Design a protein around this ligand. Structure first.
Ligand SMILES: N=C(N)c1cccc(COc2cc(OCc3cccc(C(=N)N)c3)cc(C(=O)N[C@H]3CC[C@H](N)CC3)c2)c1
Lengths: 241, 4
C-alpha cells in the first residue's frame, strides 16, 4: 500500500497473508468462512521456476500483523487443499481475476481472525464511497514490502472515468478505486487482498480484490480491483458460503 | 462477519 499507515493489531481480522514455500509473502487473501478464502487468480499461475497454481506449495497466515512475527499469539497458520481459479480468468487482461482457496483445516474465530461480509449480487458500491485497502505490499512503486500491515483510504471511481483512464483495459468485472490525483494506492504484494467497505450498521463488506495497476499511487492511474457482488452466486456455488 |  502506497500512502498508507500502520493498521492497529486485529483491525482487519479478515486479512490473510499467503506465503509460497521458501519465498515468504506473495499475495493477500480474505477470510470469508471457517474453510474459505477469496484471493486473486493471478497469484496462482505457474511459472518455469515455481508451481504457484499448486495448493500444497502455500501457507495461509490468519491474524498476522507483522511479517517478522508469524508465530505471535493469535496468529493461525494453515495449508491449502484446493485453489479454484475462476474458469473465465484471462491471463493477459486480468479479467475474472478471482480465486477461492480452501483451508486444509478450519480457521478458528477469535478477535484477530474473523470473516469479512460478502455483498449480495445486486449490491452496488457507489462512485465516491470511501473504502480501505490493506496489505503488506510495496509502500512505493519500485519500492519494498511492509513488515506491519498497511491500511489506506481510497474512493470508488466512476466506471466510465476508469475505462477512459486505462483504455481497452477495463472490463465490467473491474473497478477503479483510489484518487485521480494518486498518492494512495495498492501496489505489488497487495494482490489478492480485500477492499473493506464500512456499511450502513458499521459492519465491513468486501468491495473488491486487489488486481493490477499501472505503477502505484501515479496521477490518473488508480488501482484496479475485481468486483465482488458479481461473484456472489459463483462463491455460493463453489463453497456453500 | 465484518467487525472486531
Ligand atoms: N497500482 C496497483 N493498484 C497495483 C496493485 C497490485 C499489483 C500491481 C502491479 O503488479 C503486477 C501487475 C501485473 O500486470 C499485468 C497486467 C495485467 C492487466 C493489465 C495490465 C495493464 N497495464 N493494462 C497489466 C502482473 C503482475 C504479475 O504478478 N505477473 C506474474 C504472472 C505470472 C508470471 N509467470 C510471473 C509474473 C504483477 C499494481
Amino acid at each position: 500500500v502506497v500512502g498508507g499507515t500502520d493498521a492497529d493489531e486485529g483491525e482487519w481480522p479478515w486479512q490473510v497473508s499467503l506465503h509460497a514455500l521458501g519465498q515468504g509473502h506473495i499475495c493477500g487473501a480474505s477470510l470469508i468462512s471457517p474453510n474459505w478464502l477469496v484471493s486473486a487468480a493471478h497469484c496462482y499461475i505457474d511459472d518455469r521456476g515455481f508451481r504457484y497454481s499448486d495448493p500444497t506449495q502455500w501457507t495461509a497466515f490468519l491474524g498476522l500483523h507483522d511479517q517478522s512475527q508469524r508465530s505471535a499469539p493469535g496468529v493461525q497458520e494453515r495449508r491449502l487443499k484446493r485453489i479454484i481459479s475462476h474458469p473465465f480468468f484471462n491471463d493477459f487482461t486480468f479479467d475474472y481475476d478471482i480465486a477461492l482457496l480452501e483451508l486444509e483445516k478450519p480457521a478458528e474465530y477469535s478477535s484477530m481472525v474473523r470473516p469479512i461480509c460478502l455483498p449480495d449480487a445486486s449490491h452496488v458500491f457507489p462512485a465516491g464511497k470511501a473504502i480501505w485497502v490493506t496489505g503488506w505490499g510495496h509502500t512505493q512503486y519500485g519500492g519494498t514490502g511492509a513488515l506491519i500491515l498497511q491500511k489506506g483510504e481510497i474512493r470508488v471511481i466512476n466506471q466510465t472515468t476508469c475505462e477512459n483512464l486505462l483504455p481497452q483495459q477495463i472490463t465490467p468485472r473491474m473497478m477503479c478505486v483510489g484518487f485521480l490525483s494518486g498518492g494512495v494506492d495498492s501496489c505489488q504484494g497487495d494482490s489478492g487482498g480485500p477492499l473493506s467497505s464500512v456499511e450502513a450498521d458499521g459492519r465491513i463488506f468486501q468491495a473488491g480484490v486487489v488486481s493490477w495497476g499501472d505503477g502505484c499511487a501515479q496521477r490518473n492511474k488508480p488501482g484496479v480491483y475485481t468486483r465482488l457482488p458479481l461473484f456472489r452466486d459463483w462463491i455460493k456455488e463453489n463453497t456453500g458460503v | 462477519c465484518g467487525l472486531r
